[PDB]
Amino acid sequence: PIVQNLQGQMVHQCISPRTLNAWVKVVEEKAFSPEVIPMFAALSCGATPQDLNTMLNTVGGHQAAMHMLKETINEEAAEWDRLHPVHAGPIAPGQMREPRGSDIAGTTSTLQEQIGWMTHNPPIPVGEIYKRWIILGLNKIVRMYSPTSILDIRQGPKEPFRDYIDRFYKTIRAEQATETLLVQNANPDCKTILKALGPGATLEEMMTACQ
Amino acid sequence: PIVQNLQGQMVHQCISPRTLNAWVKVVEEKAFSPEVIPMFAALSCGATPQDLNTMLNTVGGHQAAMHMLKETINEEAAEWDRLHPVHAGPIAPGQMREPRGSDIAGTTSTLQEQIGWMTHNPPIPVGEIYKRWIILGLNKIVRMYSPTSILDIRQGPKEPFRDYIDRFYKTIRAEQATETLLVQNANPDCKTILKALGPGATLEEMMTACQ
Amino acid sequence: PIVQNLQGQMVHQCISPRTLNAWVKVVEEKAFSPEVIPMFAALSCGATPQDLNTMLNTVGGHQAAMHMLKETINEEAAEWDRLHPVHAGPIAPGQMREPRGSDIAGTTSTLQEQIGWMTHNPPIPVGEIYKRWIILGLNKIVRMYSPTSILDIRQGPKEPFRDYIDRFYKTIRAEQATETLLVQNANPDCKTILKALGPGATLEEMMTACQ
Amino acid sequence: PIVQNLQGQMVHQCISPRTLNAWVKVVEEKAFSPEVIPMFAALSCGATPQDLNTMLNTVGGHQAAMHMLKETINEEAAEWDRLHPVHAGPIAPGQMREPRGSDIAGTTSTLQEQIGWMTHNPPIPVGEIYKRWIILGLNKIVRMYSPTSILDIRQGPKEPFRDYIDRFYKTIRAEQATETLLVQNANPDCKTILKALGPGATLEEMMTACQ
Amino acid sequence: PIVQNLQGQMVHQCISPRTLNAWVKVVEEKAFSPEVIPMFAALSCGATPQDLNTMLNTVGGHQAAMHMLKETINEEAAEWDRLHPVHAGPIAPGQMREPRGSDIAGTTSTLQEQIGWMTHNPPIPVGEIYKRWIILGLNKIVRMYSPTSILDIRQGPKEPFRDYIDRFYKTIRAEQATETLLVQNANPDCKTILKALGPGATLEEMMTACQ
Amino acid sequence: PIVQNLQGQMVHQCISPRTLNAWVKVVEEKAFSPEVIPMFAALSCGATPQDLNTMLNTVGGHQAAMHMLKETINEEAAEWDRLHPVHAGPIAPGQMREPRGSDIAGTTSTLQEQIGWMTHNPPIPVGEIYKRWIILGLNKIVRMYSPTSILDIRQGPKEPFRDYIDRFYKTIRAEQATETLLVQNANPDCKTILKALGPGATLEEMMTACQ
């Protein structure tokens, strides 16, 4: 990544073994549960496009998903090239060239070029741009791998209200990577109590009532 | 977070894999036991609002609680906007804008803006303000998930006094996120001894007597 | 805590996840065995009162003990206020105020104030003062939770001398958070041998003889 | 490796125990699955040829593969010597000599020489050149140890489509260290559905249809 | 400990959680096997007397040994006071006092005083002096806890020579915290072979012969 | 070890707990498999002779081997003294003395002297010289503890070729701390195939053929 040193200047630092291992392990343990995306964003803080590719490429499983991600990336890269065309021909000697989509995605750009863009004044934040494309792709994957419709999250006859609401908001989070449906999907006993509370009741108030 | 470098100046640093993992694991292991809140406060030392959202969003379980937390945050954010209205219109070129509630909560503000506010002179400590709102919300959750009333913590016939008092003060801590009720809830044998000690007896003295 | 940077100046640093976890784990694994106190002192090197409260508050179990500790702290804080009264009224604009007992204990003081006192010239070492009060309290807890009187540590007929002396000095350490009683509590066979050695014999010499 | 210090200058740093252990463990856990190569590239960021040899030589198993790797390295080294012949005879006193293939591979060059080349202006990036040769060799090994032809990846009668596509793209990755064959190798039920979708369908769309 | 910072100056640093845990764990895992002493010396690199006491005091078991160690320390401290008497009376205002035995052992000296002595010019290396006393004491403990005389290390009829020699030199190391006795204690078959080799044979040569 | 600080100057640093533990664990897990030597070399990067002795002395097992190592070291030290005799008598006040063999091996030299030699201009690299002697000794130990002759590595009737070649090159590595013998030791079926390939066939080509 690119970080500020002790002196106060933006320099490249090697991606740490701790960062590499943390990402690989989150994917192994959590697959594409929604919370994997904020972990990715945090572990890739200050990442160059090279670092972002490293993180994605170190994943061994889920290769269908990783192929789907590459498709989203290529779509975003094509849209970048449409909005920001780069003049062809020979570059001015010793001057910074403009990044194409594939340069932002780290496939046709060198690390030195990536560092040049990211530390320029004004900076072309190719790492942040690429990360946005990756997260767009990861959001689609999270939605794809969401196992259950929110319509099928219903409280069991003996299921505690707290456990039901946890499943409900867990599913909501996965499905769109509400209080009315929550009441509708509650069990008969709890539903009667929730209907008595009236409109505008907070989740906190609903929990206390069915507890 | 924002930290002082070796030279002695406030700069942004990436949230560490160690910090990220520590928070995720405390929540997995302890849920919303009261001691999770001081751990949160310590792990989020110097946090920007972005860092605070990262920590909250990396939590995979307890999504009902996380939804309740967002409600508390929005309430605090609305109260901020009532007390500190921001003038609408175009901002002065190259000048620092005033933070709204949603800027403090990191939903409508960029990292650069957050850094600007937190390192300004005088600083607008948006991280500390947001953390206060989050902890208010976490305290409510701790109280909500407290399993037992202090009224139902009573010493068993064969339960050692030390074990009973541990349950008692554990419950007290959870319920409000005393010595009289402690005596009242003690078993017959211990109660007789504690009544003999008289008023103004310390917990230390009570323990020695029923030991 | 407060540490010296690379340049050579006292600055605040965030308490580390490693430090937080180490303390929590020692308490989980060792409870209030005597060796927990030197570990606490070492893990809290350079701690501010805020850091010390963090460490104490992150402990989830042993809440009776933690309540007893707060009592000892309040007693020490009251004694501080008796010896060092602070003049009431409005403070001089932009000047350092004098710490009361509750400021030293971190309940009525801010981190900024704590840093100000600890890095002042001359420094008011509020962290070291508070740590002394905490350790006084922890020593009482260690003595309280000591399971056995030294009078009841006696060598078994078949117990190796080395194992007996380990229990003996372990108990001595817990009870007051000697050679004569050691001999008196030895088994008949070993006692006869130890009596033959005469007075002024070192522990080393006693071990060799009953080995 | 060679890194930029706090002051902003390229200096040698010892390879870390964390890096050494991470590499050894990835090889133990993953053998030569394709994702081992990006992990190698990331763990060897800024590596000198000495560091690269250390990483390769610390591997205890897979010695057939390691011998095959040495062969690829020697081939690349010979091609380097053909393209870049070095003038024989005595070197100019106190001057930098030109690297031969075996110098780039770290077998006939000292660490000091490697540092000299890598930090020269312009730099001769012997670490990056060597790493390219190593990765060429590792790619061959990955292909060699690929257990299955893509022709033999076929969807089972009861195998979920998601599981089949994961095996498919996993095998594709190993074999060349597509959508048509994916459809051809699908089971009868899924194949009928995929044929109905028509040409130009994305993987995402195919998954939704057979889900 | 006292370390050199980045700028190049001797300053105090807090003992690390990693160091504290490493020492505690070595003692738990290895007790007083001979190799524990070089680990102690290495983990206490640059230690102040306070750090050395921390390390010793964090040990929970082996309290007989720890009491024996204190005796050795007090003996060394008394010998220091005999060789280096300190003038009594009031110290010169703002001047460095001379360390007594108990100051070197960290019982009557403050950290500030210890730092003053260790960073003085010329330095009074109180940490190194104390560590020498501690290691003298640890050596005695290692010898004390050595379970077997070298006279009782004899090769079994079916014991491989390599296994026998490992036990032999392991015991030698513990007992004094040779080739002739090694041959004498070998089994009949190996002994005959070793006698044929003649005098001046290396251990390497003896191993090859009985292998 | 001796490292370059942030400012860019050679200074002593304490050996890390991570380094100490890594070495101890590699020896426990791998004994004297050949790959232990490059791990030793890497873990001892920049080591002083004191550090090298620490690493060797922290090993608890394999004391026969450690005694054999000391013999190799003493032989190398004697050869050093023969090639580089040091003038006897009193040293020039405040001047650097010349290292003898035992000074290079860290038995008669202080850390300060070792640092002086290693950071001198020109430097006397006593750490690198000693490490060379240690590795010479470790190579002998690796060869000694090699369990099998390469003559006894033969492919089983049902053993996959890949597994056989792994054993073969593993043994080759241990025995000398080839393609013809590989073919000769292959099983009848594979041998026939390998004989058909003809001379000059690479290992890669042989693997493909018997796969």
PDB file of C-alpha atoms in Angstrom, chain E residues 60-201:
ATOM      1  CA  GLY E  60       3.731 -18.556  39.262  1.00  0.00           C
ATOM      2  CA  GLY E  61       5.140 -22.035  39.915  1.00  0.00           C
ATOM      3  CA  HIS E  62       8.454 -23.276  41.289  1.00  0.00           C
ATOM      4  CA  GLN E  63       8.321 -21.009  44.331  1.00  0.00           C
ATOM      5  CA  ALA E  64      10.902 -23.075  46.246  1.00  0.00           C
ATOM      6  CA  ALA E  65      13.350 -22.394  43.405  1.00  0.00           C
ATOM      7  CA  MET E  66      12.387 -18.712  43.319  1.00  0.00           C
ATOM      8  CA  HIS E  67      13.094 -18.502  47.070  1.00  0.00           C
ATOM      9  CA  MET E  68      16.476 -20.198  46.534  1.00  0.00           C
ATOM     10  CA  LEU E  69      17.185 -17.638  43.797  1.00  0.00           C
ATOM     11  CA  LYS E  70      16.477 -14.724  46.162  1.00  0.00           C
ATOM     12  CA  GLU E  71      19.035 -16.228  48.578  1.00  0.00           C
ATOM     13  CA  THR E  72      21.742 -16.322  45.871  1.00  0.00           C
ATOM     14  CA  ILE E  73      20.864 -12.747  44.903  1.00  0.00           C
ATOM     15  CA  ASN E  74      21.164 -11.533  48.513  1.00  0.00           C
ATOM     16  CA  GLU E  75      24.555 -13.282  48.840  1.00  0.00           C
ATOM     17  CA  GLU E  76      25.815 -11.546  45.682  1.00  0.00           C
ATOM     18  CA  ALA E  77      24.368  -8.229  46.875  1.00  0.00           C
ATOM     19  CA  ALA E  78      26.220  -8.563  50.208  1.00  0.00           C
ATOM     20  CA  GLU E  79      29.489  -9.304  48.376  1.00  0.00           C
ATOM     21  CA  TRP E  80      28.898  -6.189  46.235  1.00  0.00           C
ATOM     22  CA  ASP E  81      28.467  -4.051  49.373  1.00  0.00           C
ATOM     23  CA  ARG E  82      31.682  -5.488  50.847  1.00  0.00           C
ATOM     24  CA  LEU E  83      33.699  -4.674  47.709  1.00  0.00           C
ATOM     25  CA  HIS E  84      31.962  -1.345  46.952  1.00  0.00           C
ATOM     26  CA  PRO E  85      30.972   0.507  50.148  1.00  0.00           C
ATOM     27  CA  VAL E  86      28.815   3.620  49.630  1.00  0.00           C
ATOM     28  CA  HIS E  87      29.366   6.760  51.732  1.00  0.00           C
ATOM     29  CA  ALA E  88      26.407   7.417  54.049  1.00  0.00           C
ATOM     30  CA  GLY E  89      24.720  10.782  54.653  1.00  0.00           C
ATOM     31  CA  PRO E  90      22.850  13.258  52.423  1.00  0.00           C
ATOM     32  CA  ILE E  91      23.497  13.131  48.664  1.00  0.00           C
ATOM     33  CA  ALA E  92      24.730  16.168  46.719  1.00  0.00           C
ATOM     34  CA  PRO E  93      21.675  18.081  45.365  1.00  0.00           C
ATOM     35  CA  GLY E  94      20.752  16.828  41.880  1.00  0.00           C
ATOM     36  CA  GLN E  95      23.646  14.350  41.743  1.00  0.00           C
ATOM     37  CA  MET E  96      23.767  10.629  40.989  1.00  0.00           C
ATOM     38  CA  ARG E  97      24.153   8.393  44.069  1.00  0.00           C
ATOM     39  CA  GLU E  98      26.239   5.185  44.098  1.00  0.00           C
ATOM     40  CA  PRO E  99      24.289   1.917  43.850  1.00  0.00           C
ATOM     41  CA  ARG E 100      24.271  -0.541  46.748  1.00  0.00           C
ATOM     42  CA  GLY E 101      23.615  -4.271  46.258  1.00  0.00           C
ATOM     43  CA  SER E 102      19.884  -3.826  46.864  1.00  0.00           C
ATOM     44  CA  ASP E 103      19.822  -0.977  44.303  1.00  0.00           C
ATOM     45  CA  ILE E 104      21.382  -3.270  41.687  1.00  0.00           C
ATOM     46  CA  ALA E 105      18.761  -5.915  42.571  1.00  0.00           C
ATOM     47  CA  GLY E 106      15.990  -3.317  42.057  1.00  0.00           C
ATOM     48  CA  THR E 107      14.490  -3.535  45.565  1.00  0.00           C
ATOM     49  CA  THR E 108      15.646  -0.139  46.912  1.00  0.00           C
ATOM     50  CA  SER E 109      16.173   1.732  43.613  1.00  0.00           C
ATOM     51  CA  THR E 110      13.633   3.498  41.395  1.00  0.00           C
ATOM     52  CA  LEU E 111      13.369   3.024  37.639  1.00  0.00           C
ATOM     53  CA  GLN E 112      14.626   6.592  37.125  1.00  0.00           C
ATOM     54  CA  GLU E 113      17.738   5.834  39.187  1.00  0.00           C
ATOM     55  CA  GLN E 114      18.290   2.587  37.262  1.00  0.00           C
ATOM     56  CA  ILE E 115      18.001   4.468  33.944  1.00  0.00           C
ATOM     57  CA  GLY E 116      20.404   7.129  35.247  1.00  0.00           C
ATOM     58  CA  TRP E 117      23.063   4.547  36.127  1.00  0.00           C
ATOM     59  CA  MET E 118      22.684   2.508  32.925  1.00  0.00           C
ATOM     60  CA  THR E 119      22.833   5.531  30.561  1.00  0.00           C
ATOM     61  CA  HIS E 120      25.503   7.455  32.519  1.00  0.00           C
ATOM     62  CA  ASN E 121      28.942   8.143  31.021  1.00  0.00           C
ATOM     63  CA  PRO E 122      30.653   6.014  31.979  1.00  0.00           C
ATOM     64  CA  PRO E 123      27.600   3.784  32.563  1.00  0.00           C
ATOM     65  CA  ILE E 124      27.113   1.752  35.739  1.00  0.00           C
ATOM     66  CA  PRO E 125      25.531  -1.295  34.078  1.00  0.00           C
ATOM     67  CA  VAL E 126      23.237  -2.313  36.946  1.00  0.00           C
ATOM     68  CA  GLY E 127      21.075  -4.469  34.656  1.00  0.00           C
ATOM     69  CA  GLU E 128      24.021  -6.551  33.435  1.00  0.00           C
ATOM     70  CA  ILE E 129      25.420  -6.878  36.969  1.00  0.00           C
ATOM     71  CA  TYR E 130      22.054  -8.045  38.328  1.00  0.00           C
ATOM     72  CA  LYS E 131      21.543 -10.444  35.409  1.00  0.00           C
ATOM     73  CA  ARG E 132      24.906 -12.072  36.215  1.00  0.00           C
ATOM     74  CA  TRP E 133      23.727 -12.658  39.813  1.00  0.00           C
ATOM     75  CA  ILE E 134      20.395 -14.079  38.599  1.00  0.00           C
ATOM     76  CA  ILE E 135      22.068 -16.479  36.146  1.00  0.00           C
ATOM     77  CA  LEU E 136      24.469 -17.676  38.878  1.00  0.00           C
ATOM     78  CA  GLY E 137      21.347 -18.482  40.899  1.00  0.00           C
ATOM     79  CA  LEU E 138      19.564 -20.102  37.943  1.00  0.00           C
ATOM     80  CA  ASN E 139      22.606 -22.331  37.250  1.00  0.00           C
ATOM     81  CA  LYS E 140      22.397 -23.650  40.834  1.00  0.00           C
ATOM     82  CA  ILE E 141      18.688 -24.375  40.359  1.00  0.00           C
ATOM     83  CA  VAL E 142      19.338 -26.195  37.073  1.00  0.00           C
ATOM     84  CA  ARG E 143      21.941 -28.399  38.810  1.00  0.00           C
ATOM     85  CA  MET E 144      19.569 -28.960  41.748  1.00  0.00           C
ATOM     86  CA  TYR E 145      16.697 -30.079  39.496  1.00  0.00           C
ATOM     87  CA  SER E 146      18.914 -32.323  37.333  1.00  0.00           C
ATOM     88  CA  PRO E 147      17.166 -35.703  37.785  1.00  0.00           C
ATOM     89  CA  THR E 148      20.000 -38.134  36.938  1.00  0.00           C
ATOM     90  CA  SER E 149      23.705 -38.646  37.613  1.00  0.00           C
ATOM     91  CA  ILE E 150      25.834 -39.102  34.483  1.00  0.00           C
ATOM     92  CA  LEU E 151      26.951 -42.390  36.115  1.00  0.00           C
ATOM     93  CA  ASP E 152      23.402 -43.724  35.621  1.00  0.00           C
ATOM     94  CA  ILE E 153      23.212 -42.851  31.909  1.00  0.00           C
ATOM     95  CA  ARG E 154      23.962 -46.206  30.299  1.00  0.00           C
ATOM     96  CA  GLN E 155      23.106 -47.494  26.830  1.00  0.00           C
ATOM     97  CA  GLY E 156      20.323 -50.090  26.721  1.00  0.00           C
ATOM     98  CA  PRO E 157      20.866 -53.443  24.955  1.00  0.00           C
ATOM     99  CA  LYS E 158      18.494 -52.343  22.146  1.00  0.00           C
ATOM    100  CA  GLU E 159      18.918 -48.548  22.455  1.00  0.00           C
ATOM    101  CA  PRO E 160      20.321 -46.882  19.314  1.00  0.00           C
ATOM    102  CA  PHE E 161      23.704 -45.223  19.917  1.00  0.00           C
ATOM    103  CA  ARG E 162      22.353 -41.824  18.788  1.00  0.00           C
ATOM    104  CA  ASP E 163      19.598 -41.951  21.424  1.00  0.00           C
ATOM    105  CA  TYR E 164      22.046 -42.948  24.172  1.00  0.00           C
ATOM    106  CA  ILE E 165      24.501 -40.128  23.368  1.00  0.00           C
ATOM    107  CA  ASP E 166      21.631 -37.608  23.359  1.00  0.00           C
ATOM    108  CA  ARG E 167      20.690 -38.662  26.916  1.00  0.00           C
ATOM    109  CA  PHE E 168      24.375 -38.593  27.914  1.00  0.00           C
ATOM    110  CA  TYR E 169      25.182 -35.050  26.741  1.00  0.00           C
ATOM    111  CA  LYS E 170      21.775 -33.822  27.924  1.00  0.00           C
ATOM    112  CA  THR E 171      22.651 -35.075  31.422  1.00  0.00           C
ATOM    113  CA  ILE E 172      26.208 -33.666  31.252  1.00  0.00           C
ATOM    114  CA  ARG E 173      24.747 -30.252  30.420  1.00  0.00           C
ATOM    115  CA  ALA E 174      22.291 -30.358  33.347  1.00  0.00           C
ATOM    116  CA  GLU E 175      24.810 -31.723  35.875  1.00  0.00           C
ATOM    117  CA  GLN E 176      27.459 -29.016  35.236  1.00  0.00           C
ATOM    118  CA  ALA E 177      25.337 -25.896  34.645  1.00  0.00           C
ATOM    119  CA  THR E 178      33.828 -37.383  28.889  1.00  0.00           C
ATOM    120  CA  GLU E 179      34.475 -39.621  25.845  1.00  0.00           C
ATOM    121  CA  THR E 180      35.923 -42.298  28.175  1.00  0.00           C
ATOM    122  CA  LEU E 181      32.814 -42.507  30.386  1.00  0.00           C
ATOM    123  CA  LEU E 182      30.697 -42.463  27.203  1.00  0.00           C
ATOM    124  CA  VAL E 183      32.482 -45.610  26.052  1.00  0.00           C
ATOM    125  CA  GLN E 184      32.369 -47.200  29.521  1.00  0.00           C
ATOM    126  CA  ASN E 185      28.587 -46.634  29.734  1.00  0.00           C
ATOM    127  CA  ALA E 186      27.892 -47.995  26.210  1.00  0.00           C
ATOM    128  CA  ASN E 187      26.352 -51.450  25.774  1.00  0.00           C
ATOM    129  CA  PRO E 188      28.609 -54.512  25.237  1.00  0.00           C
ATOM    130  CA  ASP E 189      28.292 -54.603  21.423  1.00  0.00           C
ATOM    131  CA  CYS E 190      28.960 -50.879  20.888  1.00  0.00           C
ATOM    132  CA  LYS E 191      31.687 -50.811  23.549  1.00  0.00           C
ATOM    133  CA  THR E 192      33.698 -53.480  21.688  1.00  0.00           C
ATOM    134  CA  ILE E 193      33.455 -51.400  18.492  1.00  0.00           C
ATOM    135  CA  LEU E 194      34.403 -48.164  20.286  1.00  0.00           C
ATOM    136  CA  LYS E 195      37.408 -49.830  21.964  1.00  0.00           C
ATOM    137  CA  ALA E 196      38.661 -50.908  18.513  1.00  0.00           C
ATOM    138  CA  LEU E 197      38.598 -47.289  17.234  1.00  0.00           C
ATOM    139  CA  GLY E 198      41.360 -46.342  19.689  1.00  0.00           C
ATOM    140  CA  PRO E 199      42.087 -43.071  21.518  1.00  0.00           C
ATOM    141  CA  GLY E 200      41.470 -39.579  20.112  1.00  0.00           C
ATOM    142  CA  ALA E 201      38.313 -40.603  18.229  1.00  0.00           C
TER     143      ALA E 201
END
